[PDB]
């Protein structure tokens, strides 16, 4: 019954990234998602010799609340909301506006 | 004895300077074994599993130390150590 | 304990009310005795601890009856 999933292209509703679009890397249990090119933070990393990790400021991608991202309708070019129906006997996702399957 | 019990006796090789010393000089190996195993069963189990000749097995029990992690006081688990004397015609394998 | 094996009398409690009516806890004991009774049909002497009352009741009922009520209640004689 999970609406937003791995590899869905989404658009961002809220935050400094409002309006930007991207691809989902993974989801986390807390209801947070991590999106491509989205919500970069500059993180400071103490150099680690065991992992041969240099130091420096690494730009990384920080989790964003899944309420804030909408599943991107490529047909309409608009953010959408998602719903569930049963096609075949299988549970499937669709867009609310044009009621087309995904 | 049953073999099924045997394979459950011997936990691990004990590694330390004392260990190495006896292994070289007196021809003896040092084992962490299940807390409940006995000299009989350890004699059996080495003779069986490493297929070499055991002379005698001396044992002791190590009381785990007491530690602190983040103010909390824990107790490291007990365990049993076994000095295992090999009849001299044997030469060590480590697998 | 002091218990009549017949009537089931037991120690009960009560008071001394003196002449000034000062009430003081006390007991009333049953009046009890260890006695050998002749059971003919068993040809034998059963020894019961019984009150005077109990004895009288044994006279009235006969001992067979009484012992029947002792096996019935399931207490050993």
């Amino acid at each position: 019954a999970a609406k937003i999933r791995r590899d869905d292209e989404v658009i961002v509703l809220t935050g400094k990234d409002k309006g930007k679009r991207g691809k989902v890397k993974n989801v986390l249990s807390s209801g947070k998602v991590i999106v491509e090119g989205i919500n970069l933070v500059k993180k400071h990393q103490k150099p680690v010799p065991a992992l041969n990790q240099p130091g420096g400021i690494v730009e990384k991608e920080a989790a964003i609340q899944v309420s804030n991202v909408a599943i991107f309708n490529a047909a309409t070019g608009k953010a959408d909301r998602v719903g569930f129906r049963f096609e075949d006997g299988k549970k499937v996702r669709f867009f609310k506006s044009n009621s087309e399957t995904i | 004895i049953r073999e099924e019990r045997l394979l459950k006796v011997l936990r691990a090789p004990h590694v330390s300077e004392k260990a190495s010393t006896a292994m070289e000089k007196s021809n003896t190996i040092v084992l962490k074994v299940a807390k409940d195993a006995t000299k009989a069963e350890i004699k059996a189990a080495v003779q069986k599993l490493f297929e070499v000749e055991v002379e005698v097995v001396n044992t002791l029990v190590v009381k785990g130390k007491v530690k602190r992690h983040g103010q909390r006081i824990g107790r490291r688990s007990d365990w049993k150590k076994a000095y295992v004397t090999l009849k001299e015609g044997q030469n060590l394998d480590f697998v | 304990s002091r218990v009549c094996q017949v009537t089931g009398k037991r120690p009960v409690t009560g008071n001394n009310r003196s002449h000034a009516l000062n009430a003081t806890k006390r007991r009333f004991l049953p009046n009890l005795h260890s006695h050998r009774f002749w059971v003919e049909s068993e040809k034998r002497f059963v020894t019961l601890r019984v009150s005077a009352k109990g004895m009288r009741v044994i006279d009235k009922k006969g001992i067979d009856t009484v012992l029947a009520e002792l096996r019935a209640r399931g207490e050993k004689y």
Partner: protein
């Protein structure tokens, strides 16, 4: 597994069980020498054992 094991007789299962304990023994031997890379193996075998045992029981049980 567990369908696979279910179709084997009690004898072959005893034999498999012993193989498994040899493998397990050997494994924690390697792991206590620091010679193990793949740790996930322990759990693999440690659980398979249980599977086998749980069958033996029901074959005796009924």
């Amino acid at each position: 597994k567990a369908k696979e094991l279910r179709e084997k007789s009690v004898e072959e299962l005893n034999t498999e069980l012993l193989n498994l304990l040899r493998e397990q023994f050997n494994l924690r031997m390697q792991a206590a020498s620091g010679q193990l890379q793949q740790s996930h193996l322990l759990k693999q075998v440690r659980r398979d054992v249980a599977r086998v045992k749980t069958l033996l029981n029901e074959k005796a049980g009924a």
